[PDB]
Paper text:
Dcx and related doublecortin domain protein genes, including doublecortin-like kinase 1 (Dclk1), encode proteins with tandem MT binding domains, referred to as N-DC (or R1) and C-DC (or R2) (Coquelle et al., 2006; Kim et al., 2003; Sapir et al., 2000; Taylor et al., 2000), but the exact role of each of these dual domains is unknown. Cryo-electron microscopy and subnanometer-resolution image reconstruction reveal the kinesin-dependent conformational variability of MT-bound Dcx and suggest a model for MAP-motor crosstalk on MTs.
In the Dcx:MT:kinesin ternary complex (Fourniol et al., 2010), although Dcx binds at the corner of four tubulin dimers, and therefore four kinesin motor domains (MDs I–IV), the Dcx density is more closely associated with kinesin motors along one of the protofilaments (MDs II and III). Residues in kinesinII (loop 2) and kinesinIII (loop 8)—which may be important for axonal specificity of some kinesins —but not kinesinI or kinesinIV, are closer than 5Å to the Dcx density. Intriguingly, the N-terminal linker region outside the proposed N-DC core interacts with the MT wall and lies close to kinesinII loop 2, while the C-terminal linker is completely displaced from N-DC due to the presence of the bound motor (kinesinIII). Thus, because their conformation is significantly different in the absence and presence of motor protein, it is likely that residues in the linkers adjacent to the N-DC domain interact with kinesin at the MT surface and dynamically respond to the presence or absence of bound motor. Taken together with our live-cell imaging data reported for the human patient mutations W146C and S47R in Dcx, which show both a reduced overall mobility of presynaptic vesicles and a decrease in run length, our structural analysis suggests a crucial role of the N-DC domain of Dcx for regulating access of the Kif1a motor domain to MTs. It is likely that residues adjacent to the N-DC domain of Dcx interact with loop 2 and loop 8 of Kif1a at the MT surface, thus allowing a dynamic response of Dcx to the presence or absence of the motor protein.
Numbering used by the authors:
A (entry chain A): 2 to 44, 47 to 360, 369 to 437
B (entry chain C): 3 to 236, 255 to 329
C (entry chain B): 2 to 37, 47 to 439
Write the structure that this text describes.
């Protein structure tokens, strides 16, 4: 099987560097080097993310889409930056304006064809394609607009292969941009109707989880990114490993989406202990479920405790008892019968790889489909209206060839999306 | 708003035929009362059950007649023909377009609208527009204009949905409408190897917009009537339709129109304050007991009599 | 004489690798195929010095069949007999049965027609699947389906691992198991059932270990199964053919599902303790805590049991140990059934893994049976289904895979008459 990553925008891009920083080491691939793999198993399934050309050069099969040179020229001028074949860099030296409209209708719409071109060169690579990984932020141009287009096109070209989306939904407390809800509401819209698996991460849900669950005092972006990339590795790549009970994107999809919206999840990693001290090793297993299922530790902003779950997928990856795994999951399902929805006898989807995260003994990625994420699109949707009402920075959109009915559309859509999700919380 | 889910369902069983009798064919359907049909000893009640001999006239009167009045009344409505291929959907919807006896629901509707208009002609100024398009593989193609392919649904300023770029033709008379239908039928054909397969697979949608303004009263009225000949049930739109009907039947505040392009276009005419008649057609014939069961079940999604447990 | 076997679904393959292991282990055939008729009803003498496998392996993800062609045993099967569809598994019936699973079937069949020819007057195909899976539920559904027509004139005993009563895995499981039951029902001869959870209990209560790897449950069924084919197709003082089963085991055409049970489950480390009496093991068979199935005889009246014994057993010991039972009454057998006790005696005692956790006695009782008990197990699994179907839950996943409101609703009605069937054939006189 296979997949083809997609680094839309700067963020989605910045993260690319971290997702690939990791993944590679979790596959023994040095900058341009080959497979130094401490083992021999980190190779029989690599294909999922690379391509064979030389014999020591397995190149990441991702796409780097962005209308701001400097960015990709920071990712390509640093560490692992020199492993991507230049063909991968689909830049847009234009003005990468922070407008969803500027990267979806006017500026991005041009650079698109020169992207799809490659997304096809990579898809028609070899063997059988599974789906595409998509990273980006719903709070900017090259991210929400142009990346949200990249998919609307992808999903017309292969409505068969899957589409996981890793979105950095606009954090609450403080917005790292101003129109944010504009660029956001507009991209979520496109998401709820193309990709079929979305993993929403919040820069501040991370800080928290990174400053209190990792006594880490100076959580640089690199970190946040790093933590995130840690989860997306547990998801995909991982399951493309052996296991007593293994799954793969689809299983994950076909066990997690009760209703076609596409629904968004909230990823959570397992061993998340501070370096030295904490290295408690309390990782027998009840310790991992202890972790994963708590409020804090959910990369999302919202707290599960604020709304039932529809599905859950503990994708563990480290030798354990299909008994102490299958078992724990249960008590968990009974101690919290309250929030776990009922019309699904077994919400949880236990998954079990074998080999764990390179240096760790036992981990377990968590992919939750809780109704709690209602209380986020609400947020976003609110911010919109409060500012849409006055058409705040709307001239930067319309003046870029947009529509007063376009914004209406998205909000509503994504706004209805909130509605539905409640239809199950009850 | 009005009743909420003003959905009526009529089951129409196709005539028995000499060929079928010659074959010796075998027996699904038993009848009880106006409303019920029994298959495999299980009763299914509906608003009405029409046996094999029922006339086009009977179907129109029971199914369509009131809806047409509502449209003239200024309300929207939808009529569907649902069933397996060769169930009798097209016969029911169109029948023989020109034959006074043979004609189906659509011709009868057109006739009734104009006749009503001719009668009024006082201070009411009418305007009738028609659209004819099909949905295949969840894609919309204009039957009036073959160039318009893969059309997209949009909502206007006031939430009304529309098919962007879909041809809208103003029709003066019944003849004009029939010609339009004939044109659409012709246009359908081209680039199609197998019409049978194509016809069963693509939902045909005929839209009649009747607008009128009384010069004196100045009250203006507009009504849309969507006539739909669905794809064979033996499909994304069908499933979408099932979900919408069930939701309406439940009395749910939120209906799943977004699930298909068809349901999205139909949103203003289906459910809410609109009348909807679904004519499920079935063969009495032996094999597809199973398909009829499905059709009956689908009709059941809307609200009927619920049995005791 | 022989009985091919088709291990379908990762699980049916893991269990397969296991049951397949126990085999050579008690037949002196190293993983290299070579040993230094009898058992020919499960192994073809490709010449020659080797043995090979008299079965096949069907999974839509390579992962699991791949591992077989890594670990010793790698040498055992023919590179050919292990079918794969690089494509996608999908924990959904539909896709596995219809859409995807279809593409492979032909090819699959081909082997069970190519392997079915090579032999000499066979008896049937021991099928190994995991009810609630994608490749296991769906696929087989049509595999067994295409068999019942191509060889209606044989035995179709499918050995299933039906849904843990509370500890299921897949979120949809029931969708996949109400569908593998209805499609296979009108095609199997006798369906053996081994409950994944109810086997754990045995690992907790009758062997002590909270560390049971799947690799264990497999060693277990891998045992109970060895008692079915292996040893039985093997000479003895009271041989029992495969046909024998279905005949002495199914009272009615519904591909009736008996339950597998084993007697001596005791952990190594106990290995020295004085062995158990012919009477004790016999009695252990009537305990609802030792039956590889969460169908505790909560009321289910047995209606036929096939007590397969192996090892040192005196026919009188049996034709007495059973007599004592026939008169315990609290073990109430069906009415319309005077005597429903097929005593199968083999010679060679069991053969425990060199160092797993199985005691290793010199006699065992793999008793299987049809019990009005499953009236439950099916019930509890059917109900599940409704709850979700009642909301369509993951329905869009099948529809979009060449299925319809028909197949579900019409397979529900199916089992409905399986809840009435297993009710009527009992509880009444
Ligand atoms: N006893 C036993 N049960 C197993 C084993 N592996 C899986 N199972 C059970 O069988 C079911 C799992 O089926 P899956 O592995 O998800 O699927 P599959 O049937 O192989 O086919 P697919 O869904 O397409 O992957 C669960 O109920 C498991 O508890 C095994 O090795 N032994
Ligand atoms: N986790 C994370 N968030 C980022 C990174 N870079 C920008 N962001 C977030 O992305 C949003 C800004 O969008 P941006 O990526 O600049 O848009 P674009 O570059 O025009 O497509 C803010 O909410 C930031 O917190 C990053 O490297 N990691």
């Amino acid at each position: 099987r296979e997949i083809v990553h997609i680094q839309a925008g700067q963020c989605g891009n910045q993260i690319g560097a971290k997702f690939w920083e990791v993944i590679s080491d979790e596959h023994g691939i040095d900058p341009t080097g080959s497979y130094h793999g401490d083992s021999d198993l980190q190779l029989e399934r690599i294909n999922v993310y690379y391509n064979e050309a030389a014999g020591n050069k397995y190149v990441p099969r991702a796409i780097l889409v962005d209308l701001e040179p400097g960015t990709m020229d920071s990712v390509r001028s640093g560490p692992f930056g020199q492993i991507f074949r230049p063909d991968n860099f689909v830049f847009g030296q234009s003005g990468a304006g922070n407008n969803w409209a500027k990267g979806h209708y006017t500026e991005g719409a041009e650079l698109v064809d020169s992207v799809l071109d490659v997304v096809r060169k990579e898809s028609e690579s070899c063997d059988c394609l599974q789906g595409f990984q998509l990273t980006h932020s719903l709070g900017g141009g090259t991210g929400s607009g142009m990346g949200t287009l990249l998919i609307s096109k992808i999903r017309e070209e292969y409505p068969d292969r899957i589409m996981n989306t890793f979105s950095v939904v606009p954090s609450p407390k403080v917005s790292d941009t101003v129109v944010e809800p504009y660029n956001a509401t507009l991209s979520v819209h496109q998401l709820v109707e193309n990709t079929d698996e979305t993993y929403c991460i919040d820069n501040e849900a991370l800080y928290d989880i990174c400053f209190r669950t990792l006594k880490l005092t100076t959580p640089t972006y690199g970190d946040l990114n790093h933590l995130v990339s840690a989860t997306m590795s547990g998801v995909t790549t991982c399951l493309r490993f052996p296991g007593q009970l293994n799954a793969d994107l689809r299983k994950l999809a076909v066990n997690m989406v009760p209703f076609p919206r596409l629904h968004f999840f909230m990823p959570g990693f397992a061993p998340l202990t501070s370096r030295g001290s904490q290295q408690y090793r309390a990782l027998t297993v009840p310790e991992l479920t202890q972790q994963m299922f708590d409020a804090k530790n959910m990369m999302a902003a919202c707290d599960p405790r604020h709304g039932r779950y529809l599905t859950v997928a503990a994708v563990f990856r480290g030798r354990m008892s299909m008994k102490e795994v299958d078992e724990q999951m249960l008590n968990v399902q009974n101690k919290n019968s309250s929030y776990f929805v009922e019309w699904i006898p077994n919400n949880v989807k236990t998954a079990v790889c074998d080999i764990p995260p390179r240096g760790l003994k036992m981990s377990a990625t968590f992919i939750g489909n809780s109704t709690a994420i209602q209380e986020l699109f609400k947020r976003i949707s609110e911010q919109f209206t409060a500012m849409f009402r006055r058409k705040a920075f709307l001239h930067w959109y319309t003046g870029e060839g947009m529509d007063e009915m376009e914004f209406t559309e998205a909000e509503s859509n994504m706004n209805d999306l909130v509605s539905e999700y409640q239809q199950y919380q009850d | 708003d009005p009743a909420e889910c003003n959905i009526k369902v009529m089951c129409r069983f196709r005539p028995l035929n000499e060929s079928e009798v010659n074959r010796g064919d075998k027996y699904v359907a038993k009848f009880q009362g106006e409303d019920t049909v029994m298959i495999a000893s299980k009763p299914y009640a509906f608003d009405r059950v029409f046996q094999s001999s029922t006339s086009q006239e009977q179907v129109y009167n029971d199914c369509a007649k009131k809806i047409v009045k509502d449209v003239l009344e200024g309300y929207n409505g939808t009529i569907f023909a649902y069933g397996q291929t060769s169930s009798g959907k097209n016969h029911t919807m169109e029948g023989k377009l020109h034959d006074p006896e043979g004609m189906g629901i659509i011709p009868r509707i057109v006739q009734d609208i104009f006749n009503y208009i001719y009668s009024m002609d006082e201070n009411l100024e009418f305007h009738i527009k028609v659209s004819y398009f099909e949905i295949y593989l969840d894609k919309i193609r204009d039957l009036l204009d073959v160039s318009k392919t893969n059309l997209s649904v949009h909502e206007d300023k006031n939430r009304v949905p529309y098919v962007k770029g879909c041809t809208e033709r103003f029709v003066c008379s019944p003849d004009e409408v029939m010609d339009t239908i004939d044109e659409g039928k012709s246009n359908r054909h081209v680039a199609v190897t197998n019409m049978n397969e194509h016809s069963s697979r693509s939902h045909s949608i005929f839209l009649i917009n009747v607008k009128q303004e009384n010069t004196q009263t100045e009250q203006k009225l507009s009504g849309k009537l969507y006539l739909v000949d669905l794809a064979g049930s033996e499909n994304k739109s069908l499933s979408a339709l099932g979900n919408v009907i069930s939701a309406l039947a439940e009395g749910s505040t939120y209906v799943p129109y977004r699930d298909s392009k068809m349901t999205r276009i139909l949103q203003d005419s289906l459910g809410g304050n609109c009348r909807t008649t679904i004519v499920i057609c079935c063969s009495p014939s032996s094999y597809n007991e199973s398909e009829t069961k499905s059709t009956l079940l689908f009709g059941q999604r809307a609200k009927t009599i619920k049995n005791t447990v | 004489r022989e009985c091919i076997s088709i291990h379908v679904g990762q699980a049916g393959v893991q269990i397969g690798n296991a049951c397949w292991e126990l085999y050579c282990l008690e037949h002196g055939i190293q993983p290299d195929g070579q040993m230094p008729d009898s058992f020919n009803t499960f192994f073809s003498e490709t010449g020659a010095g080797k043995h090979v496998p008299r079965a096949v392996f069907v999974d839509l993800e390579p992962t699991v069949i791949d591992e077989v062609r890594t670990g010793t045993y790698r040498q055992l099967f023919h590179p050919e007999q292990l079918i794969t569809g690089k494509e996608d598994a999908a924990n959904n019936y539909a896709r596995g049965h219809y859409t995807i699973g279809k593409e492979i079937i032909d090819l699959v069949l081909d082997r069970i027609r190519k392997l079915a020819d090579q032999c000499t007057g066979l008896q049937g195909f021991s099928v190994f699947h995991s009810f609630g899976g994608g490749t296991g539920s769906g696929f087989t559904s049509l595999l067994m389906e295409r068999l019942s027509v191509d060889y209606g004139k044989k035995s179709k005993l499918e050995f299933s691992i039906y849904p843990a009563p509370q500890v299921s895995t897949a979120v949809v499981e029931p969708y996949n198991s109400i569908l593998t039951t209805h499609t296979t029902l009108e095609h199997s001869d006798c369906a053996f059932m081994v409950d994944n959870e109810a086997i754990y209990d045995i690992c907790r209560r009758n062997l002590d270990i909270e560390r049971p790897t799947y690799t264990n449950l497999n060693r277990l069924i891998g045992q109970i199964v060895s008692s079915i084919t292996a040893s039985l197709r093997f000479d003895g003082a009271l041989n029992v053919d495969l046909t024998e089963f279905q005949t002495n085991l199914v009272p009615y055409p519904r591909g009736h599902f008996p339950l597998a049970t084993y007697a001596p489950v005791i952990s190594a480390e106990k290995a020295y303790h004085e062995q158990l009496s012919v009477a004790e093991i016999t009695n252990a068979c009537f305990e609802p805590a030792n039956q590889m199935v969460k169908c505790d005889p909560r009321h289910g009246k047995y209606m036929a049991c096939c007590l397969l014994y192996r090892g040192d057993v005196v026919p009188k010991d049996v034709n007495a140990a059973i007599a004592t039972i026939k008169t315990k009454r609290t073990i109430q057998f069906v009415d319309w059934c005077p005597t429903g006790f097929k005593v199968g005696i083999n010679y060679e005692p069991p053969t425990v893994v060199p160092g797993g956790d199985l005691a290793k006695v010199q006699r065992a009782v793999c008793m299987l049976s049809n019990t009005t008990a499953i009236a439950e197990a099916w019930a509890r699994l059917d109900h599940k289904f409704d709850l979700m179907y009642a909301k369509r839950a993951f329905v869009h996943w099948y529809v979009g895979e060449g299925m319809e409101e028909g197949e579900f609703s019409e397979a529900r009605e199916d089992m409905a008459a399986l809840e009435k069937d297993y009710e009527e054939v009992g509880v009444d006189s």
